[PDB]
Amino acid sequence: TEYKLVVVGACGVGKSALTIQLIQNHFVDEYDPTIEDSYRKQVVIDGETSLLDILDTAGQEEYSAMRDQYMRTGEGFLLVFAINNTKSFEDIHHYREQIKRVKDSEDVPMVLVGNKSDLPSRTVDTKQAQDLARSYGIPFIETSAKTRQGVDDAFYTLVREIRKHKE
Ligand SMILES: *CCC(=O)N1CCN2C(=O)c3cc(F)c(-c4ccc(F)c5sc(N)c(C#N)c45)c(Cl)c3OCC[C@H]2C1
Ligand SMILES: Nc1nc2c(ncn2[C@@H]2O[C@H](COP(=O)(O)OP(=O)(O)O)[C@@H](O)[C@H]2O)c(=O)[nH]1
């Protein structure tokens, strides 16, 4: 089994850092915000070996048929915000709207991810993110790409959401 996962969210939330921690087992202090790539990782989740194909979205917005088609290939989406950036949390609505549009569905596998959980400067309350996740009917996971907190849990939770949706 192979799962196409797409990491989305505003600039600077840690999409690349999360992806590179997952794939390469190290934290990036800076990562060019124009670099977009897909990465593969073999994992075992609930006793089943699977291949994750992870798209780390980057660059500028693009509302073309080709870009929509590419994003539509995603089976599940990580909605990433940073816990020290309220605007990034505000932006989650936009990302969800675009996913709902291209997937033409209200039941797309998604996980809300509050990244940078290692930092002291929190501006988004855990309870606020949990309330919105509850309203959306999706899991919420706090992560740190720096320390590895929650990283596997975020991606593996998303896989579990996909498995439930496709079986
Ligand atoms: C700092 C650079 C960065 O990481 N950025 C800035 C620009 N970004 C976007 O504006 C962006 C928004 C967005 F909603 C999507 C997107 C999500 C889901 C989806 F189904 C579709 S279809 C479609 N077309 C787009 C677009 N555009 C989306 C994406 Cl893919 C964005 O661009 C990626 C970078 C993102 C964060
Ligand atoms: N302390 C801390 N910094 C992080 C974390 N995730 C990302 N960063 C930093 O935040 C900045 C933006 O990360 P990046 O992955 O480029 O964000 P992207 O634009 O969403 O791809 C970089 O300086 C990263 O080192 C995290 O969990 N903790």
Ligand SMILES: [Mg+2]
């Ligand atoms: Mg990036």
